[PDB]
Amino acid sequence: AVKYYTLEEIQKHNNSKSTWLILHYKVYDLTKFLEEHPGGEEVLREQAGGDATENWEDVGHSTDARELSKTFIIGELHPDDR
Numbered sequence: 001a002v003k004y005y006t007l008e009e010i011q012k013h014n015n016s017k018s019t020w021l022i023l024h025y026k027v028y029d030l031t032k033f034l035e036e037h038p039g040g041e042e043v044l045r046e047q048a049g050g051d052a053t054e055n056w057e058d059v060g061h062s063t064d065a066r067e068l069s070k071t072f073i074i075g076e077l078h079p080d081d082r
C-alpha cells in the first residue's frame with residue numbers, strides 16, 4: 001500500500017513543530033532532522049510546506065546525503081497534484 005498526501009495538507013506542516021516537504025513525488029518529514037542538517041535548519045524552514053525538489057538538486061547534495069534522505073519518507077504526493 002501507499003499513503004498519499006495532497007499539496008493542500010502538506011502546506012500546513014511548515015514549522016519547527018512539524019516540517020514536511022516534497023522531493024519529486026515523495027513526502028519527507030524532516031522535523032527531527034532540522035537541527036541535525038549540515039546545511040543548517042534555516043534553509044530547510046524556508047522550504048517547509050512545499051516542493052523543494054529544485055533547491056535540493058541545485059545545491060549539489062552528495063550520494064551520502066541522498067541515501068540518508070530516504071530515511072525521512074512518510075508517503076507520496078497524491079497523483080492529482082503531480
Ligand code: HEM
Nearest residue numbers: 028038039043047052055056059060061062064065068069
Ligand atoms: C531530505 C533531507 C535532506 C538531507 C538528508 C540533507 C543532507 C545534507 C547533507 C548530508 C549535507 C552535507 C553535504 C552533502 O553530503 O551533500 C547537506 C548540505 C546542504 N543541504 Fe541538505 N539535506 C536535505 C535537504 C535539503 C534541502 C531540501 C535543502 C535546500 C532547500 C538543503 C540545502 C543544503 C545546503 C545549502 C547544504 C550546505 C552546502 C554547503 O555548505 O556547501 N538540504 N545536506
